[PDB]
Motif scaffolding. Structure first.
Motif, PDB file in Angstrom:
ATOM      1  N   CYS A   1     -23.297  -6.582 -15.133  1.00  0.00           N
ATOM      2  CA  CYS A   1     -22.881  -7.517 -16.176  1.00  0.00           C
ATOM      3  C   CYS A   1     -21.402  -7.843 -16.052  1.00  0.00           C
ATOM      4  O   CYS A   1     -21.005  -9.007 -16.159  1.00  0.00           O
TER       5      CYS A   1
ATOM      6  N   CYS B   1     -29.801  -1.864 -19.106  1.00  0.00           N
ATOM      7  CA  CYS B   1     -29.499  -3.281 -19.214  1.00  0.00           C
ATOM      8  C   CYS B   1     -30.783  -4.067 -18.991  1.00  0.00           C
ATOM      9  O   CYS B   1     -31.422  -3.923 -17.946  1.00  0.00           O
TER      10      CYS B   1
ATOM     11  N   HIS C   1     -30.404  -6.720 -15.976  1.00  0.00           N
ATOM     12  CA  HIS C   1     -30.320  -6.181 -14.630  1.00  0.00           C
ATOM     13  C   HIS C   1     -31.300  -5.050 -14.362  1.00  0.00           C
ATOM     14  O   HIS C   1     -31.413  -4.618 -13.209  1.00  0.00           O
TER      15      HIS C   1
END
Ligand SMILES: [Zn+2]
Ligand SMILES: [Zn+2]
Length: 155
Positions: free
Chosen positions: A92, A111, A114
């Protein structure tokens, strides 16, 4: 010097980034806004007394970001967060160089974008991350590994 917030940026990260753009200490920003030591409390994610409407509007007057947008730099009502550990998704950060308030949500460990575990310390040297207000460059303060490169060591 005014700055536009990044999407999802935490209040601590945004405050520190505003201070760096204006060469301000936390106490200096507090005096500019008329609320003093409250700024440093928020930078360390301490909200035993939750940010009040008057305090958010006081900061909003200085940084020229509406109190409603500042509230989106904190968890929504009912969402628990943690001041420690400070966490990071390096993938990120490579896309947008900020700490996200979501990374302090107690329920968050991965996340979603991802599909990687988020980091609770530098994966190269194990140094914990400082409070986001102090993320002056995008690198580990100890070993100097860029946060963006830490994406390669995320699991
Ligand atoms: Zn990510
Ligand atoms: Zn490191």
């Amino acid at each position: 010097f005014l700055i536009k917030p990044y999407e999802g940026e935490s209040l601590s990260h945004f405050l520190g980034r505003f201070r760096r753009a204006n060469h301000l200490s936390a106490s200096g920003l507090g005096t500019l806004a008329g609320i003093g030591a409250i700024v440093a409390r928020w930078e360390r994610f301490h909200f035993n007394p939750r940010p009040s409407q008057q305090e958010l509007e006081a900061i909003a007057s200085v940084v020229e970001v509406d109190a409603q947008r500042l509230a989106q730099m904190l968890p929504p009502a009912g969402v628990g967060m943690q001041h420690e550990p400070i966490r990071l998704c390096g993938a990120c950060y490579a896309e947008s160089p900020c700490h996200r308030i979501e990374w302090q949500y107690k329920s968050v460990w991965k996340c979603d974008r991802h599909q990687l575990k988020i980091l609770a310390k530098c994966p190269n040297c194990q140094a914990p991350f400082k409070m986001p207000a102090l993320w002056e460059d995008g690198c580990c303060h100890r070993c100097r590994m860029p946060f963006a490169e830490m994406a390669k060591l995320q699991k």
